[PDB]
Design a protein around this ligand. Structure first.
Ligand code: CLA
Ligand code: CLA
Ligand code: CLA
Ligand code: CLA
Ligand code: CLA
Ligand code: CLA
Ligand code: CLA
Ligand code: CLA
Ligand SMILES: CCCCCCCCCCCCCCCC(=O)OC[C@H](COP(=O)(O)OC[C@@H](O)CO)OC(=O)CCCCCCCCCCCCCCC
Ligand SMILES: CC1=C(C/C=C(\C)CCC[C@H](C)CCC[C@H](C)CCCC(C)C)C(=O)c2ccccc2C1=O
Ligand code: SF4
Ligand code: SF4
Ligand code: SF4
Lengths: 73, 80, 709, 41, 149
């Protein structure tokens, strides 16, 4: 109804904060939460930085594939 | 044909016998209730399964029960 | 006690035969109910007349009919809904109406907003009068039964007085008001300078200037020198070039002739003075060559039963409404109606649905009469008995025709679709490969085109312009009417119509004939007209009553009517409607793609449904967004109907049991025990939502498409 | 009369009166505080 | 989360400008003093005030130019979801408590089903005021053990 009456700025749009937080904790830097693997000073990052972290971090931050796509309302 | 069973919660109000459209049920004497009678189902080979008998039983749960089974020409209501 | 009582209260509110068994009381209640309905109709007319006086651009439209869109509704600016106030022209903002009220007022001679106010006040007064009359005739002075059964006097008055005198009075109004005012309007005279209608009556030389025959007075009428009145009583035929409707003089002459004929016809049946026939005598004495004994016994049946009369009247009214819908698009009776496409599409679809509903009602009430009022002992009739004694032959033959028609009308479409898909366009049933020409219809068209001048010496032009041979008519740069070609595409769709009508007739007639009894349930009459089933015996006896036959026939009526309106819409958009340039080249809205695209099922899905629905789905943000909102809402109702149609009653009762337990846990258990809907009610709820959703979707689609283009 | 009060207390009429008053009230706030998405208090 | 405030949203400004331009297109069609023009002029001001108020409340807009709601519990966005939530809970509890209290009162009658159709208005008017203190009433009734049958 809000968009039918020509006023799109009245829509109830809610950001999926929890899934975005999970994605940030997995190493995605498209939101800026800086938690866990997205934080370079964390205990989690230092544990696996020299085993598998570089390739996974490179793959997840490439936005041309379907690995942890960006989400919205 | 179908199977019709009568249980001992009968009160002998004769409604099921009147509701049968094929003359399957009948009433017999029995000293287990005030009315001193109970229903019976001696001709179940003519039952068609319309369950008009169960719609007439007034007990908490039916004292007459019909279980559907092998179906024949008589129980299918076929005239051709 | 339980919740089914609330539902049963509204289900039997108007079933007077169940309340009482006395015919007198039923007749009195029927009379009062009719009075109440008349009052409601008068109130509706008063509202319609008032709204066009205060919240409409009628005058601006009257000064420029072609370029201004009619409007009679205005919205309050509360929640931002004032976006629906579009720019309809004439310095006015509002919702564009499609009921064709402006054309009626213009053809009646109305020029200002003062007359509409007076009409609204009069209609309100009449509504109050009707309500008081209903109260009086039920509570104070209720007639006797013998008054209602005088059907010889009812027919005389309803023919001579209601229909005979109404036409004469309307012809008088037309002659005295509508002809001169419309002549002044058609001459380019500004509407505010036209003399008031009473000036024509008071001043006679003003009328004599327009029509010299008015100078002679009423003497030529009495002297039988009727040729002098030919100035305003013509037999021209065809459409008016200025406005695009029929000549008003033709309408006046037609109404005069109709009034005289009805007045003559109203003096047939016998009354106290002993001249005229008696209906019973006509029915009894009639014995042709194959009837034998005759119609002896129908008078009592039709005078002692309300359901038989209701069924007959409903069938006749439905057929009449369908005829009215067909006869108004081809011979437009009002000025500036043919070239206004939004109203033309809306008037054809309304009356078709009304007629279909009334026909289904006729079938239902015939079934009700057969179940309830049938009496072979006291009201024996021979013809009904003979029809009931060979009902097996009637149904089995009607069953065969449906299969034959369905195969030979739908397999042609499927064959065309397959041949198109396989890359073999030379093997389809079309105008280029295999032709199935409707030769009889083309012969009829040629005969009707050539009828003037040979078989109709007094006619100057053909009755309508649809018969090929006439000339194109243009009003304000738009196309009003032109000959309609008939080809192979029109051969298939007519047989589709025939197939659907035959299937609906089969369902309804089977229900009516087998209402009393059948080979499966010999005692079906004792079970009633409206009962769900007779148990799971004999393999299953679901939906054996006549009510369920009407319930099934509603779906097929809806299916049949929908194809008719789609056919009309596409054929008119592709072959008639359009625009004409200054040099005389006609460009139709869809460019004549009906001939080649309407022979396969893919053509209707791609060229009609997909292509013509782009207007409604792009209406967001504009003044037509209400149609876009109603388009989506109707799908929800249609899909919501399927829950009741596909499911049963036990599951919902058990679910309600669990819910009631959860309510009992917190001492919020109502004393009125909740119950799921009955078997019959669940069916009635589903079909209502189904029809509502389908009709609303089609309504929004049509209205959003045709207003924009 | 007593019958007038008894008919006025029946469920449909009372529900219609309540819902009409409710709709009027809601329109009143929507007119007084239009286009509202967050609480500024 | 990558969101920018409304007051610094170029797409928000573009939306406002486009809506105003579309509204002003229909204003040129009528005389300036006419009633339709007067009604149209009141729409532009409403749009301007709505956009100003949306900017003034610190709402967050994305790359689309449309405000987003944050319901994770941040103290800077308690008016979006937390504040209206408690109000709805209070009102719904009021309604439920009134409905529950009416049924219990009439349960002891000889024909309690008759009071569910013809509502006892004098009895209902007294219970209505009692729903104001429903949180305290329910809290006390839960402890005493009378809440559940
Ligand atoms: C029964 C209701 C219900 C169900 C089945 C779900 C299910 C889901 N939600 Mg969800 N949600 C709910 C209610 C519900 N939600 C409510 C009421 C809110 C608003 C507070 C949210 C806000 C929310 C967000 C912001 C997100 C989800 C997401 C998701 C998905 C991932 C799972 C997750 O994060 O769980 C979340 C589970 C909860 C938050 C628990 C809520 C369930 C309780 C019982 C509701 C009680 C409401 C309570 C009365 C309100 C108190 C507030 C008051 C004090 C002001 C999943 C499909 C995520 C997703 O993937 O989206 C794409 C995501 O990002 N939800
Ligand atoms: C069945 C006939 C019918 C219908 C459908 C309508 C419908 C409408 N009328 Mg209406 N009206 C009618 C008969 C009818 N009228 C009659 C017979 C009269 C007296 C001659 C009026 C006098 C009237 C006035 C004076 C006004 C309307 C208005 C309206 C509109 C708003 C209604 C409203 O706010 O009600 C609210 C609810 C109530 C119960 C009242 C609505 C489209 C209003 C309108 O269009 O304003 C822009 C308005 O001001 N009507
Ligand atoms: C104030 C005037 C008045 C009063 C006090 C009564 C009183 C009575 N009438 Mg009555 N009647 C009236 C006017 C009145 N009538 C008028 C004007 C008509 C002509 C239409 C009738 C026609 C009529 C009939 C045919 C019958 C009665 C009967 C009765 C008696 C029992 C029915 C009843 O009231 O149950 C309660 C009934 C109602 C409250 C009526 C509600 C029905 C709807 C609301 C009518 C409104 C029309 C429509 C639905 C509204 C607009 C359309 C749309 C919005 C839906 C009762 C003594 C019955 C009787 O005596 O049988 C023994 C009976 O059979 N009346
Ligand atoms: C055969 C009868 C007949 C016909 C053809 C017409 C035709 C017409 N009338 Mg009309 N009228 C009639 C009888 C008829 N009237 C009677 C009896 C009355 C008095 C109640 C009126 C009162 C009346 C008024 C007050 C007005 C009209 C108007 C009109 C014109 C508008 C178009 C229209 O209504 O749709 C087409 C209409 C029909 C097809 C009529 C169907 C009704 C049927 C024919 C009833 C008669 C049954 C009869 C036995 C024939 C059987 C059906 C037939 C197909 C075999 C139209 C030319 C309007 C007008 O002049 O505007 C310019 C107008 O304002 N009429
Ligand atoms: C019931 C309908 C009706 C009514 C009330 C009238 C009424 C009238 N007509 Mg009239 N008239 C009618 C139908 C009617 N006419 C029809 C159908 C025709 C066509 C034959 C005429 C042809 C006609 C003529 C030719 C004249 C009248 C005149 C008159 C007026 C003088 C008498 C009077 C107001 C006369 C007049 O204009 O007087 C001022 C006059 O000269 N009428
Ligand atoms: C002149 C026309 C006419 C008349 C006088 C009657 C009269 C009658 N019909 Mg009937 N009927 C008609 C036309 C007519 N019918 C048509 C055209 C059809 C075909 C659809 C039917 C189909 C039909 C059936 C199938 C049955 C009847 C029955 C009856 C009898 C009882 C009716 C009743 O209790 O309704 C009570 C009134 C209602 C239930 C109201 C219906 C409400 C509709 C369906 C919903 C409308 C939705 C609306 C658009 C949205 C409103 C929203 C709002 C609520 C907020 C009564 C004698 C019944 C009968 O005799 O059984 C023994 C019966 O079973 N009729
Ligand atoms: C079989 C089809 C058919 C039909 C439907 C009609 C119909 C009609 N003819 Mg007709 N006519 C027909 C065959 C037909 N004719 C044939 C075969 C001939 C011989 C060539 C005529 C010769 C004829 C004449 C001479 C006249 C009519 C007239 C009329 C009209 C009025 C008739 C009347 O009495 O009033 C009417 C539309 C009359 C007319 O033109 O009315 C305006 C008229 O004067 N007809
Ligand atoms: C005031 C009465 C009342 C109360 C206290 C409850 C309470 C409850 N219902 Mg409930 N219900 C009611 C009326 C009521 N219902 C009515 C009238 C209906 C039929 C429409 C339902 C249909 C219903 C279903 C289908 C379900 C519940 C469920 C529930 C439980 C989950 C919480 C909830 O809100 O569910 C949500 C409740 C609703 C969405 C119901 C709609 C609210 C209605 C419209 C309020 C009516 C108030 C009424 C007019 C009181 C008048 C008071 C006046 C006399 C002063 C909860 C115990 C659920 C449950 O746990 O299983 C049992 C569940 O699945 N209810
Ligand atoms: C055969 C062609 C129709 C002949 C005809 O006149 O039909 C109608 C006719 C019955 O007519 P009635 O005897 O009812 O009436 C004759 C009239 O002249 C007087 O009422 O039926 C037959 O003659 C045979 C019907 C066979 C089945 C026809 C199915 C279609
Ligand atoms: C959904 C469904 C139901 C459930 C639907 C029910 C119980 C109908 C009743 C629903 C309404 C909404 C109940 C309204 C109750 C009160 C009027 C509510 C008052 C409170 C406020 C709204 C004022 C059936 O009972 C059923 C039966 C047979 C075939 C199919 C179905 C079926 O599909
Ligand atoms: S099921 Fe029908 S036929 Fe069989 S005993 Fe019962 S009532 Fe008689
Ligand atoms: S079966 Fe039912 S109806 Fe028949 S006697 Fe027993 S209790 Fe009565
Ligand atoms: S219970 Fe349902 S499915 Fe079974 S016979 Fe009755 S209506 Fe048919």
């Amino acid at each position: 109804v809000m968009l039918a009456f020509g006023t799109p700025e009245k829509q109830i749009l809610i950001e999926p904060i929890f899934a975005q937080w999970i994605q940030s904790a997995h190493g995605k830097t498209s939101y800026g939460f800086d938690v866990l693997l997205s934080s370079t000073s964390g205990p989690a990052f230092n544990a696996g930085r020299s085993i598998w972290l570089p390739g996974w971090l490179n793959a997840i931050n490439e936005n041309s594939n379907s690995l942890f796509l960006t989400i919205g309302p | 044909s179908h199977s019709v069973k009568i249980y001992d919660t009968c009160i002998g109000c004769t409604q099921c016998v009147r509701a049968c459209p094929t003359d399957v049920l009948e009433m017999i004497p029995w000293d287990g209730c005030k009315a001193k009678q109970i229903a019976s189902a001696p001709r179940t080979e003519d039952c068609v399964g319309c369950k008009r008998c169960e719609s007439a039983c007034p007990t908490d749960f039916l004292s007459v029960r019909v279980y559907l089974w092998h179906e024949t020409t008589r129980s299918m209501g076929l005239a051709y | 006690d339980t919740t089914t009582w609330i539902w049963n209260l509204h289900a039997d509110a108007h079933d007077f035969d169940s309340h009482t068994s006395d015919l007198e009381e039923i007749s009195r209640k029927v009379f009062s109910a009719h009075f109440g309905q008349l009052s409601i109709i008068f109130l509706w007319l008063s509202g319609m007349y008032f709204h066009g006086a205060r919240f409409s651009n009628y005058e601006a439209w009257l000064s420029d009919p072609t370029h201004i869109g009619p409007s009679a509704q205005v919205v309050w600016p509360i929640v931002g809904q004032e976006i629906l106030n579009g720019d309809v022209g004439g310095g006015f903002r509002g919702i564009q109406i499609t009921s064709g009220f402006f054309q009626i007022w213009r053809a009646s001679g109305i020029t200002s907003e003062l007359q509409l106010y007076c009409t609204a006040i009069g209609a309100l007064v009449f509504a109050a009068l009707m309500l008081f009359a209903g109260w009086f005739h039920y509570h104070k002075a209720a007639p006797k039964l013998a008054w209602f059964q005088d059907v010889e006097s009812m027919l005389n008055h309803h023919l001579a007085g209601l229909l005979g005198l109404g036409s004469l009075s309307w012809a008088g109004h037309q002659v005295h008001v509508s002809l001169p005012i419309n002549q002044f309007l058609n001459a380019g005279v500004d509407p505010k300078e036209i003399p008031l209608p009473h000036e024509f009556i008071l001043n006679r030389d003003l009328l004599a200037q327009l029509y010299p025959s008015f100078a002679e007075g009423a003497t030529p009428f009495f002297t039988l020198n009727w040729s002098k009145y030919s100035e305003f009583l013509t037999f021209r035929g065809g459409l008016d070039p200025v406005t695009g409707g029929l000549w008003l003089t033709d309408i006046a002459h037609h109404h005069l002739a109709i009034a005289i004929l009805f007045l003559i016809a109203g003096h047939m049946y016998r009354t106290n003075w002993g001249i005229g026939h008696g209906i019973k005598d006509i029915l009894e004495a009639h014995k042709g060559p194959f009837t034998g004994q005759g119609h002896k016994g129908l008078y009592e049946i039709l005078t002692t039963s309300w359901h038989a009369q209701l069924s007959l009247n409903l069938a006749m009214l439905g057929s009449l409404t369908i005829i009215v819908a067909h006869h108004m698009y081809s011979m437009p009776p009002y000025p500036y109606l043919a070239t206004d496409y939004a109203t033309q599409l809306s008037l054809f679809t309304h009356h078709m649905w009304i007629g279909g509903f009334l026909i289904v009602g006729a079938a239902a009430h015939a079934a009700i009469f057969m179940v309830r009022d049938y009496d072979p002992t006291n009201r024996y009739n021979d013809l009904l008995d003979r029809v009931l004694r060979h009902r097996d032959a009637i149904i089995s033959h009607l069953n065969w025709v449906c299969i034959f028609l369905g195969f030979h009308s739908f397999g042609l479409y499927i064959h065309n679709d397959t041949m198109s898909a396989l890359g073999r366009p030379q093997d389809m049933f079309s105008d280029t490969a295999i032709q199935l020409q409707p030769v009889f219809a083309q012969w009829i068209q040629n005969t009707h085109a050539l009828a003037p001048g040979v078989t109709a010496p007094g006619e100057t032009a053909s009755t309508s312009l649809t018969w090929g041979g006439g000339e194109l008519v243009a009003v304000g740069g738009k196309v009003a009417l032109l000959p309609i070609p008939l080809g192979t595409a029109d051969f298939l769709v007519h047989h589709i119509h025939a197939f659907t009508i035959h299937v609906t007739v089969l369902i309804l007639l089977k229900g009516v004939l087998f209402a009393r009894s059948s080979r499966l349930i010999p005692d079906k009459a004792n079970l009633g007209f409206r009962f769900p089933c007779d148990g799971p015996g004999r393999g299953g006896t679901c939906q054996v009553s006549a009510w369920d036959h009407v319930f099934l026939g509603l779906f097929w009526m809806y299916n049949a009517i929908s194809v008719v309106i789609f056919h009309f819409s596409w054929k008119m958009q592709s072959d008639v409607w359009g625009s004409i340039s200054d040099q005389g080249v006609v460009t139709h809205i869809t460019g004549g793609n009906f001939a080649q695209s309407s022979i396969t099922i893919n053509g209707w899905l791609r060229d009609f449904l997909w292509a013509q629905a782009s207007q409604v789905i792009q209406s967001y943000g504009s003044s037509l967004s209400a149609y876009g909102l109603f388009f989506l809402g109707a799908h929800f109702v249609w899909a919501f109907s399927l829950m009741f149609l596909f499911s049963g009653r036990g599951y919902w009762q058990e679910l309600i049991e669990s819910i009631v337990w959860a309510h009992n846990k917190l001492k919020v258990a109502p004393a009125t025990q909740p119950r799921a809907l009955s078997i019959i009610q669940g069916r009635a709820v589903g079909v209502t939502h189904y029809l509502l959703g389908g009709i609303a979707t089609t309504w929004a689609f049509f209205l959003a498409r045709i207003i924009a283009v | 009369m007593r019958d007038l009060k008894t008919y006025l207390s029946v469920a449909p009429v009372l529900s219609t009166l309540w819902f009409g008053s409710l709709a009027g009230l809601l329109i009143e706030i929507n007119r007084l505080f239009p286009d509202a998405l967050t609480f500024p208090f | 989360s990558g969101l920018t405030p409304c007051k610094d949203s170029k797409q928000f400004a573009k939306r406002e400008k486009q809506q105003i331009k579309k509204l002003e297109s229909s204003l040129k069609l009528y005389a300036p003093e006419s009633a339709p023009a007067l009604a149209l002029n009141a729409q532009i001001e409403k749009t301007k005030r709505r956009f100003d108020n949306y900017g003034k409340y610190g709402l967050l807009c994305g790359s689309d130019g449309l405000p987003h709601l944050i319901v994770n519990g941040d103290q800077r966005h308690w008016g979006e979801f937390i504040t209206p939530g408690i109000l709805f809970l209070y009102i719904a509890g009021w309604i439920g408590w009134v409905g529950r209290s009416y049924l219990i009162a009439i349960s002891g009658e000889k024909k309690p089903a008759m009071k569910e159709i013809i509502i006892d208005v004098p009895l209902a008017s007294r219970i209505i005021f009692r729903g104001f203190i429903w949180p305290v009433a329910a809290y006390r009734e839960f402890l005493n053990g009378d809440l559940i049958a």
